[PDB]
Amino acid sequence: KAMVPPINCIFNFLQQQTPVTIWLFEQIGIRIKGKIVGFDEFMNVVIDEAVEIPVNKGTPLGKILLKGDNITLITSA
């Protein structure tokens, strides 16, 4: 088709407002589910309606400015 850079990929992912599964660091880290509302150049992603589930009973979290250095992987659930 064409090339889709990651900044425009996250920008289209922001426009579509799909349900989001954001992963993090390993076994200490906890997988978060929410919806993206804002990001920046250091990949500090702002998410809303966050429910956290540990690695294989979720708890609501609200609105979160997740920092960049722990973000590993972003999927559309």
């Binding site: 200490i28 880290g29 702002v46 979160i64 400015l65």
Partner: protein, 73 residues
């Protein structure tokens, strides 16, 4: 639509919570100031080890090295 810098300048003077990378240190207090490297300054913070509290701390400076996220209640 929004960016982390206007959301974080508007996050000043609110009971916010910050989780660290270690899953045993969570500081919940009132945000005072934040720079462009996103260092955090809180007041009357409370320690949360795995959910349970230990005591009040007060004016505290949380380094952006060990933060994981900041939340708004």
């Amino acid at each position: 639509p929004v960016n982390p810098k206007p959301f974080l300048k508007g996050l000043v003077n609110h009971r916010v919570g910050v989780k660290l990378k270690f899953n045993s240190t969570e500081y919940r207090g009132t945000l005072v100031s934040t720079d462009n490297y996103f260092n955090l300054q809180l007041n009357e913070a409370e320690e949360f080890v795995a959910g349970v509290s230990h005591g009040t701390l007060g004016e505290i400076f949380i380094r952006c090295n060990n933060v994981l996220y900041i939340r708004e209640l």
